Amino acid sequence: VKELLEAGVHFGHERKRWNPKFARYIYAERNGIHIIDLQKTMEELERTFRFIEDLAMRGGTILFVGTKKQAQDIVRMEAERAGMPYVNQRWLGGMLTNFKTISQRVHRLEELEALFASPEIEERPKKEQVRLKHELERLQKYLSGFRLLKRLPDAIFVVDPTKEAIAVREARKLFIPVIALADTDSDPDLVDYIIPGNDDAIRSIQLILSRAVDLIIQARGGVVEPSPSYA
Amino acid sequence: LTDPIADMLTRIRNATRVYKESTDVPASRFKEEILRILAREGFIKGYERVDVDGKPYLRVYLKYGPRRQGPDPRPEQVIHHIRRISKPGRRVYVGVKEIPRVRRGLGIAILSTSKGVLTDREARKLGVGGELICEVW
Amino acid sequence: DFEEKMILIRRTARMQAGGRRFRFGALVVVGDRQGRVGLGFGKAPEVPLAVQKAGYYARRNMVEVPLQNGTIPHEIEVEFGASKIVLKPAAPGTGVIAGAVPRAILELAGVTDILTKELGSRNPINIAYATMEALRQLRTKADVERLR
Amino acid sequence: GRYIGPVCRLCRREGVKLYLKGERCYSPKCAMERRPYPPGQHGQKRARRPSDYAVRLREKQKLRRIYGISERQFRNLFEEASKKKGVTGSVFLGLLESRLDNVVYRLGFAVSRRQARQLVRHGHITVNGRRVDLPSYRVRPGDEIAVAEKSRNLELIRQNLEAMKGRKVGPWLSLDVEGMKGKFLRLPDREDLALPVNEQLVIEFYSR
RNA sequence: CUGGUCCACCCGUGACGCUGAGGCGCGAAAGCGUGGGGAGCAAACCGGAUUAGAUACCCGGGUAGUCCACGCCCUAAACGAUGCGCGCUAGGUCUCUGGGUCUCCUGGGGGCCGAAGCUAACGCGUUAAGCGCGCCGCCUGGGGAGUACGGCCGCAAGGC
RNA sequence: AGCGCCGGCCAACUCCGUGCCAGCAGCCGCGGUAAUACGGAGGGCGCGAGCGUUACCCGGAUUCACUGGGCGUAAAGGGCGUGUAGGCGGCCUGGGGCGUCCCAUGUGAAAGACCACGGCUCAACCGUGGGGGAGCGUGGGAUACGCUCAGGCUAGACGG
């Protein structure tokens, strides 16, 4: 499912703001820009997707993590396709390490779903309606994707392992495997299954994540053709 | 450069600690023998006589353990511990009866004997002592 | 279930206007006497809470010690800060020769005959941590050749 | 000499039943049955956690008070056992059990070791024929420990020996009743005897 | 007039090296001796303030000295409170100064942030306080005390 | 049958007397009218013809650190060069065999020490037998490392 002209969309970036541990995944710096060995990206995807597929057909969740503005929506898109949890907005410390406690906050969201499902007394004061609404709206912003996650994930998918340092550290502290799209400014050794490629351009994120989902959806029953994306 | 042997052991220790594939040490017959033992005991993958900018060297191919889970995924070293015993400042010599057991057998003592460079096991079999070069584990 | 031993329980203070206010800390080792031990340091505003909390971490952080006829496989020495612990294999008639802190941890680990020595700083906490990370570095003839 | 004083208070302090009298030890008039709490004004107050030192002291005193032996002889025997080959714990207990006054008691010649001592001391016992009036004599394998034929017509030994007719005697011993004589077969395992004693704690006490 | 030092060429010598108890030399300021010099400044000193007082701080004066030559003195928070040499162990960034092919690369300095590692912590981190070897100096609870005594040095002060 | 002890270290708690007094104290510390810390008592703990005290030695003290420590701020880098002795020293080959390693051998008295057996009723004590070792003398052997003598080398150092 992997394709070959990802060259058409990314082959890496960033001038010498690199992490030396990312050396083995670099071809050269042509424009004064670290360019990624796309053959390495291929070979890695082969190893990585193999892990993904196996995890899919054994029926276990993958928590997709993206928070940078460019990968914001694109992860809500494709993770929804998989029907798998994501965190798009703020990564709340202890989402894994303090799971049960954060999960105490979906119940609130849950209980606000029901209460506002009407009426169960709209005879609650004026000032309260506005409040609890603002609450639900609020809760909705952050726990929208995390609410699907009803128990500790089997692995996580990160768009930027550097940006998402905390998440990488939480999962790792829990022996939960970590798969990641990572460019030259990330730390390879911290990542279990690497996608050495640009993590900034939405194009690359789109290619890698959508095609990642195509692995997920295909392996747990049926398949499907193209998924929503901005040019 | 006062102790080539200690420099070599140290060149290795520094390299393994940051997980280099190999490392180069300036070459000598006596160093080869030590590496010979090091490889044949599995502390290193092996070595080869290479040349750096015209100069004879020994490229030592490092070996580690499997990647690990948890917060620190760096793999366990194969050579945890290597340090000189006999030094230019204080030569150390043992007779066959004074040869030490490194780490209850889990490690090796390398010595230079009048039968050549041997491990503590080897030296004890051949029944000879010598200068206690270093210990590895 | 495992066996528990409280090694250290201390009261500490913090200063505020109007006076000091206290908090308690508990060192607890946990083990089955068959090769599983764990160490946790629990602190809370009253003793029994702290002790229980210490129990929790003790179970979370465990370690597998490779017992052999009731002794450890090889000599090991470990430094934790200024605290240094020395561990030496010992034969059947020996017993566990150690101070209260490393004894408890070794004892619950199923060690029956060992020689030890505390060097450097003998801070109970740092010595307990050092003992653990020493056990954690014990290898077997198997482990050794497997690596190499 | 030996402790030679009130003996129930010893079991009471030690929190376990030590059988230091014989008969009354099995009666309901036993003190451990009536008041199983330490002697003196403070017996019924709640115990605070015993220190490690405390623990090992007690375990050692238990083992000691069992044999009515001095701390001196006790320590010497221990020191002998430590430098002696093998495992200290067994060897210590073995050497303890090899005391004449002890063997005399294990063979039912007496109800207590205190009584056994007075028997040995007063020469009413012999070892391989020869009279031995020293409680400290180390009985070795193959020794015949008999009543003195000049003392065989003694009330106490009789009533005691009557009580032993088919009564079992430890695997390491053999008693020929009616003949009033017994034999020492071999030195007893820690296993081969069930003393209310963790003898490792004694090792730890003397390593302080 | 004269020392150190860096670079490029890789031309010559062929381990000629490292350190270094003693020794020798250098060694800020203040101070000393002989002689000059003396504007400004300024110990001591005199006066005015301030203040409860003010042998100070502030103000107005003011002599050594501060400067030059020669000879002494030999101390210091003489500090990076970090001996010298060599090898090894991510990088990022600013800068000084060489050589490239001048994007940038590579030498030698001077900073900053940081990999691994170290550290009691603070912090250090290719200008190590990391990992090693060599040699030297030094520490071994606080005060008494860098005092006394002895010795050596100094004109003295006083130094070791 | 006695002696010490019962605040923590450190095993053993209460009543009275006292009221920063009398006194205790190895260290930390106790005593100012409800003292488990002084004095007695009851009780308890520990040893027992002994128990405690003073003195001194080794230990705990890796607190002179060979095993086995340190010196930025804790005590600790010489103010800095220069250099004498000394310590230490790159790559290859050969001679010698000094250090070093191995074997043989002589010496290592007896007592003591350790294992076994045995004699005094046991023990202490004593007898009998057994196994060593370093160290040095001698003989033969080994040559990797260190040393030395010899010959090459250019990677250190120096010079053009």
Ligand code: SF4
């Ligand atoms: S009677 Fe009960 S208490 Fe008194 S000695 Fe016999 S066992 Fe011990």
Ligand SMILES: [Mg+2]
């Ligand atoms: Mg990025």
Ligand SMILES: [Mg+2]
């Ligand atoms: Mg050494």
Ligand SMILES: [Mg+2]
């Ligand atoms: Mg410490």
Ligand SMILES: [Mg+2]
């Ligand atoms: Mg340290």
Ligand SMILES: [Mg+2]
């Ligand atoms: Mg063993």
Ligand SMILES: [Mg+2]
């Ligand atoms: Mg200390």
Ligand SMILES: [Mg+2]
């Ligand atoms: Mg202390």
Ligand SMILES: [Mg+2]
């Ligand atoms: Mg293991």
Ligand SMILES: [Mg+2]
């Ligand atoms: Mg009984």
Ligand SMILES: [Mg+2]
């Ligand atoms: Mg215990």
Ligand SMILES: [Mg+2]
């Ligand atoms: Mg023994």
Ligand SMILES: [Mg+2]
């Ligand atoms: Mg039985």
Ligand SMILES: [Mg+2]
């Ligand atoms: Mg019994």
Ligand SMILES: [Mg+2]
């Ligand atoms: Mg002792």
Ligand SMILES: [Mg+2]
């Ligand atoms: Mg040339």
